Design a protein around this ligand. Structure first.
Ligand code: HEA
Ligand code: HEA
Ligand SMILES: CCCCCCCCCCCCCCCCCC(=O)OC[C@H](COP(=O)([O-])OCC[N+](C)(C)C)OC(=O)CCCCCCCCCCCCCCCCC
Ligand SMILES: CCCCCCCCCCCCCCCCCC(=O)OC[C@H](COP(=O)([O-])OCC[N+](C)(C)C)OC(=O)CCCCCCCCCCCCCCCCC
Ligand SMILES: CCCCCCCCCCCCCCCCCC(=O)OC[C@H](COP(=O)([O-])OCC[N+](C)(C)C)OC(=O)CCCCCCCCCCCCCCCCC
Ligand SMILES: CCCCCCCCCCCCCCCCCC(=O)OC[C@H](COP(=O)([O-])OCC[N+](C)(C)C)OC(=O)CCCCCCCCCCCCCCCCC
Ligand SMILES: CCCCCCCCCCCCCCCCCC(=O)OC[C@H](COP(=O)(O)OCCN)OC(=O)CCCCCCCCCCCCCCCCC
Ligand SMILES: CCCCCCCCCCCCCCCCCC(=O)OC[C@H](COP(=O)(O)OCCN)OC(=O)CCCCCCCCCCCCCCCCC
Ligand SMILES: CCCCCCCCCCCCCCCCCC(=O)OC[C@H](COP(=O)(O)OCCN)OC(=O)CCCCCCCCCCCCCCCCC
Ligand SMILES: CCCCCCCCCCCCCCCCCC(=O)OC[C@H](COP(=O)(O)OCCN)OC(=O)CCCCCCCCCCCCCCCCC
Ligand SMILES: CCCCCCCCCCCCCCCCCC(=O)OC[C@H](COP(=O)(O)OCCN)OC(=O)CCCCCCCCCCCCCCCCC
Ligand SMILES: CCCCCCCC/C=C\CCCCCCCC(=O)OC[C@H](O)COP(=O)(O)OC[C@H](N)C(=O)O
Ligand SMILES: [Cu+2]
Ligand SMILES: [Cu+2]
Ligand SMILES: [Cu+2]
Ligand SMILES: [Mg+2]
Ligand SMILES: [Zn+2]
Lengths: 157, 54, 52, 495, 98, 75, 115, 59, 196, 55
């Protein structure tokens, strides 16, 4: 009988930010794949599920827009885009990019889709080992947020 | 060349994640490939007059 | 989507109002925007009139 | 102020930013191109005149040989790769895949300053030292090693320059591959990246595989010169040297050309307002040309005494590599149709000239592929005509498309279209008058790398004289146009 | 305070392995140097001699670089800075195997 | 175009459609390569056969090559 | 003036409802799978360029093997460890026709054609 | 009390934060810039000596 | 007008065949490009959707393949035709390439002052209609015995004895060159062959 | 041509038959189409009586 202690990973900073919240960071850096030629052929002949599409309001209506979220600085214009061909008359060869003000209703008049690109700033505790291990309250966070709004904070580069 | 280990240490402590690690490992692989090609070239140099028996 | 004919008449009246009061304004604003972009790129600054 | 001067120097010497390194690469590439053009003008003036008008001695033809060798090396390694790959590769590659910097940021600066040390050694050796290297850009032994006129340390410094240039290119290639593989924004698959990025990737794969062999060959030359070994002497195999060099050599030319294809495709998408016709086909043809280029190197050695079956094989392989280039040319021709390309654009007309001249050069080089027919065309002016109507009339015009496209984007001032039209048209006509006759001079039997020719070849060189004057006019127009680009008005009054 | 601990350093597996590998590499280098000087009759100025010596000299240079890497990894393992998933360890392992 | 050879032959029926299509692509790549090799090998062997025929019909009555080239033993 | 026609008003060219193409998730994708999705899966553009690549590679390999098999000068006698050497005859070309140079058609001539 | 733990926290809590790890060591940076200047001077001198044929040792 | 050889005649006819094919392709592309450009500059025939056509792409990649196999077959046959005369000779001539002059059977050929660059003081004599073997090599650097009018270009490399077969049918003097950079006097190192 | 997958078609058919029974119409799929087409028919007359809006 013996006791074993696995050697922990001591790295801080970007690594500890990644390991604190792996769902969000993975979402940020997880590659997703598009359909090949045979897969496009197999998808274009799949059926709709129910007759709802004949009655409901599609995703991308003036009342049900496509809301998307980027990270950055408050007020900075957001980079978004299509993969092409949201409409029959729109190009589909390659992805088409867009620069749009944040938190505003934009309309793509190529496809006709209304979208809400918006920014959420990734404000996180200074990762130097002083991060809190138990539930924290709104006071210290209130001070830090006030300082960030009034003056700004450094970038993790 | 002592600057490489110092910056390496201080960047691993602060700037590292799986994307960076994958980049570094792929670069290591390419460097190993280049060394293999160098050895292949030198073996070509050596065996040019030995395979030709006469 | 309108289902019976009364809903069709209601949506037709709404469409007529919207056309007179919300769609033609949009059309004319967009036409002006296109012409203004042409004017901005005209005068040797950009490639307006080279094709199209 | 000392602080301001040090800030500027540190800004341009400690940098690891892809945009800054890209503009540095572009500037160095343009300067090297101008130097090579000056040397080429000296060569042409030597050829255009009878009775050794410039060197005035048969004992002093080593000056002419130095000219040809340094012209070849400068124009190949220091002009077209720093501009085609270094300039737009660093500036654009991270931008098109939506990332901040290339992976290994420091290695980029290391690469650029390795290029700079190479240029410095080369210039100091071939300008400020007596009796430079005089053996052509293909430094064939025993001329390079065992020769009376090649004994000084200038030759060794030139060989070490080749080494440092190879090192810089390898570093750049590794960096490009790594950055493109892992640093794409979410939702962008590998084969949906911009076509220029794929061409850069395949060029990088080409450079990685072949440069170490060139390093081995050049070290063999150095050891023959210094350690007095017989690797390539009478008890050696100069043919071994040739095999190694050319195993590097042809991948080098495809490395030069492919990024021009990528840039042309990108700019076309931008200036015709329509996507590439058969983008998948063009990408697959690029990779196919890249891979096939590794199996053909000995088509430059049909007269050294190869085995007859090997000659047959190398002619076959050259035809195989011909195929995908034809596919690409057809794709370009169909891409331009049904577009709205600007009708008064130097980029559009440069694309026309690029396409035509590249098709002509490809056909002429396809004639050379046949082993038998290469008996009559090796080491004549037909080969010079070929690789100048490719390099100096297609690759150059691709870079002119890129130049007249990206200047308004890098500096934010439009382009003087009429001035640029004069430059481009005179460059086209002047070059066609210099290189085209070479073809018919090669068939008639004129040999290359000679300053004095028999009286039978007068008309070809008279047409070359005409072309050289037109080229001088065109390049002066180009440099003056760029100076005028960054200068404010000089006259203004009231009407 | 940060104080070097020889007890922990010697109770660590990475430190022992890298030191042993560095020692064996030095032994190999010394042995190979002993056969280049006082064993062979042909020099680098011959036909086979030159190619053979170029090959073995390149291999010896790579062995010297690998010895430097193993010494560096021994230094880092003594300090306890090398973890199981260390890319330094991966690089040294791959290089030595090559 | 390139229709899927495995569908009218019933091969790789246990695989998902994507991987079955990958096998079809591999088969077509194999076919396209064998064409030119077949053409050139056929031409080479025809050339060897014709050379044997010529050596038979020219050195039939020779006294030096009447038994080697004439008979085709070591053409 | 039929229900479908009304329900078809949002599915005509003029007022077609937009639809965004989707992604998919792949649990593990190495380079091989990338190829299987990048180059394979586009076998109308990749067909003949890939065929050219394969033909070049196969021709090079075949040339090398054929040379190592039939060329008289080449020999894996000093290239391969002694355990495999007894399968090599490096002087065969010098031993043909008992070494006597007096009768062509007794000395092999390794040419592709027209030997 | 693990040395790696102490080293990490010292990198964060025991030193003045420098944006450049090479600057985290002051004297080494001095030595490195001195080496750069030394290499520049050596290169200039070698170029001068090799071209002019006099090796500067006799003067 | 005579050819002076049959190897060279074969090379010339192969060259003519390739020229015919390439000029036909060039004319076809010229017509296509003329139509495209005439439509483009007048701002007619615009279509943004025309970015693909599967059958056209397959056809235009198939056509170059089938028209290049013929060329490759013809080239390979021409090579082997060049090399089949070996063994049917009765004269051996040794050529040594020295620094800016040739040596034929221990006789030095140097450029003369009677001709500008083309004549030498000692030609190389071979009988008409007589297969000969030239054993070519060099002593110091790489030269290239180049007589392309008889379809011959053999690199004379130090320490590498090349063997070529020569057979002239037209009597007269043929002028060739060194065709390989050998130094200062590379442009003044000609070759003269007398077929008598 | 649109392809639609009718989920829970048994429940859909049961509910449709009951709806058609309540309205006093035949409980057959053709009757459902006829009823839905009768719902939307006659809209032109209602269109014609719409008074125009002010400019
Ligand atoms: C990329 C390579 C490159 C480029 C651009 C050139 C450009 C030119 N070259 Fe040459 N050349 C070679 C590569 C190149 N060359 C090589 C490899 C050899 C063989 C060396 C050997 O034989 O040993 C050779 C040999 C060679 C000879 C050999 C003569 C002899 O062997 O008998 C001659 C003479 O006619 C010649 C002429 C020219 C001329 C007149 C130009 C140009 O003047 C014509 C076009 C001019 C341009 C304007 C291009 C210059 C561009 C700038 C102005 C920079 C600005 C940037 C851009 C425009 C984007 N070149
Ligand atoms: C970037 C520069 C570049 C490019 C793109 C090329 C492209 C090609 N090159 Fe060359 N080459 C050089 C640069 C280049 N080359 C240089 C610098 C030298 C000299 C080195 C030295 O000796 O100093 C050289 C030398 C050289 C030789 C040496 C001749 C001699 O030395 O004896 C040969 C012969 O095999 C050759 C062949 C080819 C071929 C077959 C192509 C092919 O890629 C071309 C294929 C293109 C096409 C064929 C056009 C498309 C055609 C159609 C539109 C359809 C028609 C199709 C059919 C009829 C089937 N090149
Ligand atoms: C993990 C990395 C390991 C690196 C070390 C080497 C690994 C082994 C494989 C290396 C392959 C690549 C280098 C050799 C290829 C070049 C050979 C050469 O000189 O060819 C020209 C020579 C011909 O030379 P030549 O006939 O023109 O002239 C010789 C020189 N003179 C003129 C003086 C006579 O051979 C060939 O061309 C043969 C055909 C090419 C293919 C050769 C394959 C060799 C296979 C070796 C198998 C055994 C390996 C293990 C033991
Ligand atoms: C003419 C011959 C050409 C072929 C030569 C073949 C021999 C080998 C040549 C190798 C040069 C190319 C290296 C490719 C990349 C290697 C891995 C790499 O750089 O990793 C990133 C790291 C540096 O990356 P970084 O600092 O840019 O940042 C990456 C991000 N982090 C650090 C967070 C991971 O490389 C090193 O640390 C280098 C090792 C240090 C010791 C050796 C220094 C050599 C410097 C290069 C020039 C050498 C000239 C001689
Ligand atoms: C810059 C790098 C560092 C400085 C140069 C190192 C390389 C020097 C090469 C010449 C050595 C000559 C010598 O004295 O050899 C003595 C020794 C031994 O010479 P020896 O065998 O003649 O000595 C006589 C021995 N007996 C007693 C048997 C007669 O040579 C070698 O060991 C060969 C080493 C050659 C170099 C191999 C490494 C590769 C070189 C760089 C390649 C780069 C390619 C990519 C770019
Ligand atoms: C020689 C040609 C080299 C070309 C480039 C090689 C690239 C290798 C990259 C390896 C890499 O990035 O590893 C990451 C690893 C680090 O992996 P990491 O990123 O996980 O960092 C973990 C760090 N710790 C352990 C502290 C938690 O770093 C190294 O391997 C060290 C850097 C490379 C070696 C530096 C050697 C310095 C000593 C002096 C060298 C000069 C000697 C001069 C000659 C002397 C002759 C007697
Ligand atoms: C993928 C990249 C593959 C690159 C190699 C492709 C080789 C194709 C075959 C070429 C060939 O057979 O060349 C023969 C040539 C020697 O020919 P020759 O001297 O005329 O006569 C035979 C001997 N009397 O042979 C030679 O000159 C030497 C042998 C061929 C080259 C060997 C290269 C080894 C691999 C190097 C690294 C590749 C990295 C990519
Ligand atoms: C009527 C024309 C002649 C008038 C009298 C002679 C002097 C002419 C002026 C000399 C300086 C050139 C003018 C300044 C300039 O910007 O030149 C650019 C111009 C390019 O365009 P350009 O060739 O003029 O096209 C229309 C044809 N005239 O021209 C060039 O780029 C030509 C190359 C430069 C020439 C000047 C060289 C240095 C000064 C002498
Ligand atoms: C990895 C690489 C390995 C190394 C490479 C190995 C070799 C590669 C490939 C080899 C095959 C190349 C092509 C072979 C065909 C040509 C040889 C042939 O078939 O020769 C037969 C014939 C000989 O006849 P001949 O002696 O002229 O006449 C006697 C009485 N009339 O020949 C002639 O008549 C010769 C005259 C014509 C020459 C031009 C080309 C002819 C090609 C086909 C000839 C036969 C026609 C059949 C095809 C139908 C065409 C419509
Ligand atoms: C794996 C081992 C590869 C080497 C095997 C060598 C032993 C077999 C052998 O000797 O094969 C016969 C021949 C070499 O015999 P040799 O008499 O030297 O050659 C005749 C003249 N050229 O060699 C040959 O016929 C070809 C030998 C190599 C064929 C297989 C190469 C690929 C092996 C897998 C990778
Ligand atoms: C032919 C002769 C030459 C041959 C050799 C050269 C070969 C070719 C050129 C190779 C590339 C050389 C590039 C220029 C290097 C010049 C030195 C340099 O840039 O030094 C920068 C360095 C910055 O030091 P750092 O620690 O960053 O401090 C910043 C503020 N405290 O600051 C310092 O080091 C101190 C200040 C130096 C200022 C410049 C030199 C005066
Ligand atoms: C499909 C995509 C493009 C294909 C390429 C087409 C482009 C045109 C270019 C080239 C055409 C095709 C390229 C492929 C080249 C085919 C030529 C080839 O290997 O001969 C095979 C060789 O003669 C056969 O010799 P074998 O070993 O049987 O016999 C010898 C000896 N007696 C022996 O002991 O065995
Ligand atoms: Cu080539
Ligand atoms: Cu000569
Ligand atoms: Cu010469
Ligand atoms: Mg040559
Ligand atoms: Zn869209």
């Amino acid at each position: 009988d013996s006791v074993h202690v696995f050697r922990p990973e001591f790295a801080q900073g970007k690594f500890r930010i990644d390991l604190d919240q792996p769902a969000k960071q993975n979402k940020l850096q997880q590659q997703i794949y598009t359909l090949t030629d045979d897969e496009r052929e197999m998808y274009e002949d799949e059926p709709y599920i129910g007759v709802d599409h004949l009655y409901e309001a599609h995703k991308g209506s003036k009342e049900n827009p496509v809301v998307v979220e980027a990270i950055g600085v408050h007020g900075n214009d957001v980079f978004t885009g299509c993969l092409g061909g949201c409409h029959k008359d729109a190009a589909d060869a390659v992805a088409y990019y867009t620069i749009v003000p944040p938190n505003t209703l934009a309309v793509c008049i190529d496809c006709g889709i209304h979208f809400v690109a918006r920014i959420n700033e990734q404000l996180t505790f200074w990762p130097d080992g002083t991060q809190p291990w138990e539930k924290v309250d709104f006071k210290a966070v209130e001070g830090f947020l006030y300082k960030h709004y009034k003056y700004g904070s450094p970038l993790m580069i | 060349n002592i600057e490489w280990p110092l910056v390496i240490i201080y960047e691993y402590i602060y700037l590292t994640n799986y994307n960076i690690q994958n980049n570094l490992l792929y670069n290591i692989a390419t460097f190993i490939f280049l060394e293999i090609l160098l050895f292949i070239g030198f073996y070509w140099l050596y065996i040019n007059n030995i395979i030709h028996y006469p | 989507v309108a289902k019976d004919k009364y809903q069709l008449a209601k949506q037709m009246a709404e469409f007529q109002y919207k056309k007179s009061y919300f769609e033609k304004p949009w059309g004319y604003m967009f036409a002006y925007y296109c012409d203004e972009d042409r004017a901005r790129l005209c005068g040797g600054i950009g490639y307006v009139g080279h094709h199209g | 102020m000392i602080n301001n001067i040090m800030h500027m120097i540190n800004k341009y010497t400690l940098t690891t930013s892809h945009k800054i390194i890209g503009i540095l690469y572009g500037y160095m590439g343009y300067i090297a191109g101008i130097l090579g053009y000056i040397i080429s003008m000296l060569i042409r003036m030597e050829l255009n005149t009878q009775g050794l008008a410039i060197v005035r001695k048969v004992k002093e033809v080593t000056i002419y040989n130095n000219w040809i060798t340094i012209h070849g090396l400068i124009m190949l390694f220091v002009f077209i790769m720093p501009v085609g790959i270094g300039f737009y590769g660093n500036y654009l590659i991270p931008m098109l895949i939506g990332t901040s910097e290339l992976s290994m940021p420091r290695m980029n600066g290391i690469s650029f300053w390795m290029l700079i040390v190479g240029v410095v050694i080369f210039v100091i050796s071939n300008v400020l030292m007596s009796k430079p290297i005089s053996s052509g850009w293909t430094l064939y032994p025993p001329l390079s090693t065992r020769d009376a006129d090649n004994i000084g340390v200038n030759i060794d410094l030139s060989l070490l320059v080749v080494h440092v240039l190879g090192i810089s290119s390898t570093i750049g290639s590794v960096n490009y591959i790594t950055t493109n593989k892992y640093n794409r924004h979410v939702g962008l698959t590998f084969m949906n990246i911009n076509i220029y990025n794929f061409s850069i990737i395949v060029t990088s794969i080409l450079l990685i595989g072949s440069l170490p062999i060139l390093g081995v060959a050049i070290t063999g030359l150095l050891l023959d010169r210094n350690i007095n070994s017989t690797i390539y002497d009478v008890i050696g195999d100069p043919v071994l040297y040739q095999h190694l060099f050319w195993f590097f050599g042809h991948p080098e030319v495809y490395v030069i050309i492919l990024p021009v294809f990528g840039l042309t495709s990108l700019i076309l998408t931008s200036i015709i307002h329509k996507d590439i016709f058969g983008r998948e086909g063009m990408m697959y043809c690029i990779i196919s040309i890249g891979v096939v280029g590794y199996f053909v190197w000995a088509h430059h050695m049909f007269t050294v005494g190869l085995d007859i079956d090997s000659r047959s094989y190398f002619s076959i392989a050259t035809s195989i590599i011909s195929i995908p280039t034809s596919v690409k040319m057809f794709s370009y021709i169909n891409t331009w149709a049904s577009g709205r390309g600007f009708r008064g654009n130097n980029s559009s007309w440069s694309f026309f000239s690029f396409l035509i001249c590249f098709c002509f050069g490809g056909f002429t080089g396809l004639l050379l592929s046949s082993g038998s027919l290469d008996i009559m065309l090796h080491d004549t002016y037909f080969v010079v005509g070929h690789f100048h109507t490719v390099l100096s009339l297609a690759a150059t015009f691709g870079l002119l498309i890129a130049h007249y496209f990206f200047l308004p984007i890098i500096f934010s001032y439009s382009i003087f279209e009429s001035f640029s039209f004069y430059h481009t048209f005179l460059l086209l006509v002047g070059a066609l008058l210099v290189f085209y006759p070479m073809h018919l001079a090669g068939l008639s039997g004129m040999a290359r790398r000679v300053p004095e020719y028999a009286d039978i070849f007068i008309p070809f060189m008279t047409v070359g004289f005409h072309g050289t004057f037109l080229l001088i006019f065109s390049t002066l127009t180009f440099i003056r146009s760029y100076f005028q680009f960054l200068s404010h008005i000089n006259h203004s009054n009231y009407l | 305070p940060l104080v070097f601990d020889p007890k922990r350093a010697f109770n660590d597996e990475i430190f022992l392995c890298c030191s042993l590998c560095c020692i064996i590499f030095l032994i190999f280098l010394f042995n190979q140097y002993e056969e280049f000087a006082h064993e062979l009759s042909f020099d680098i100025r011959e036909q086979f001699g030159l190619g053979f010596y170029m090959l073995l000299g390149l291999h010896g240079s790579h062995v010297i670089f690998g010895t430097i890497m193993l010494a560096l990894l021994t230094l880092w393992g003594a300090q306890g800075s090398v973890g199981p998933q260390s890319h330094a360890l991966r690089f040294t392992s791959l290089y030595v195997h090559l | 175009v390139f229709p899927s050879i495995t569908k009218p032959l019933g091969l790789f029926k246990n695989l998902p459609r994507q991987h079955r299509a990958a096998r079809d692509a591999s088969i077509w790549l194999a076919i396209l390569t064998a064409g030119p090799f077949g053409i050139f090998i056929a031409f080479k062997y025809y050339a060897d056969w014709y050379d044997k025929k010529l050596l038979m019909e020219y050195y039939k009555d020779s006294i030096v090559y009447g038994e080697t080239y004439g008979k085709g033993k070591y053409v | 003036s039929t229900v479908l026609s009304i329900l078809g008003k949002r599915f005509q060219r003029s007022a077609l409802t937009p639809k965004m193409n989707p992604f998919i998730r792949i649990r593990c994708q190495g380079p091989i799978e990338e190829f299987q999705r990048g180059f394979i899966g586009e076998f109308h553009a990749f067909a003949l360029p890939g065929a050219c690549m394969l033909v070049a590679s196969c021709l090079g390999t075949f040339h090398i093997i054929r040379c190592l098999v039939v060329n008289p000068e080449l020999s894996l006698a000093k290239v391969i460890p002694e355990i495999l050497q007894p399968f090599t005859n490096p002087n065969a070309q010098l031993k043909a026709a008992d070494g006597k140079d007096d009768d062509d058609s007794q000395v092999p001539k390794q040419w592709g054609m027209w030997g | 009390k693990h040395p790696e733990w102490v080293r990490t926290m010292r990198m964060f809590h025991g030193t003045v934060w420098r944006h450049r790890p090479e600057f985290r060591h002051p004297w080494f940076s001095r030595g490195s810039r001195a080496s750069g200047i030394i290499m520049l001077v050596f290169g200039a001198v070698a170029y001068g000596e090799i071209t002019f044929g006099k090796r500067l040792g006799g003067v | 007008m005579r050819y002076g050889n049959r190897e060279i005649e074969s090379i010339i006819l192969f060259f003519d065949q390739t020229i015919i094919l390439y000029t036909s392709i060039i004319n076809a592309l010229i017509v296509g490009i003329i139509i495209i450009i005439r439509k483009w500059y007048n701002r007619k025939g615009i279509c943004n959707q025309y970015i693909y056509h599967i059958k056209i792409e397959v056809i235009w990649t198939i056509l170059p393949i089938i028209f290049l196999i013929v060329i490759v077959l013809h080239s390979v046959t021409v090579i082997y035709n060049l090399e089949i005369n070996k063994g049917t000779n009765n004269k051996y001539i040794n050529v040594i390439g020295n620094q800016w002059y040739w040596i034929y059977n221990n006789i030095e050929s140097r450029i003369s002052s009677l001709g500008r660059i083309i004549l030498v003081d000692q030609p190389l004599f071979i009988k008409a209609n007589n297969n000969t073997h030239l054993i070519i090599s060099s002593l110091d650097v790489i030269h290239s015995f180049a007589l392309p009018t008889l379809g011959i270009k053999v690199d004379a490399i130090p320490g590498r004895i090349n063997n070529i077969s020569i057979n002239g049918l037209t009597q007269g003097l043929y002028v060739g060159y060194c065709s390989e950079l050998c130094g200062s006097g590379h442009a003044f190192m000609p070759i003269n062959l007398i077929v008598y | 041509e649109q392809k639609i997958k009718i989920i829970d078609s048994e429940v859909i058919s049961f509910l449709a038959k009951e709806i058609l029974g309540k309205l006093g119409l035949e409980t057959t799929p053709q009757a459902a189409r006829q009823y839905l087409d009768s719902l939307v028919e006659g809209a032109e007359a209602l269109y014609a009586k719409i008074a125009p809006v002010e400019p």
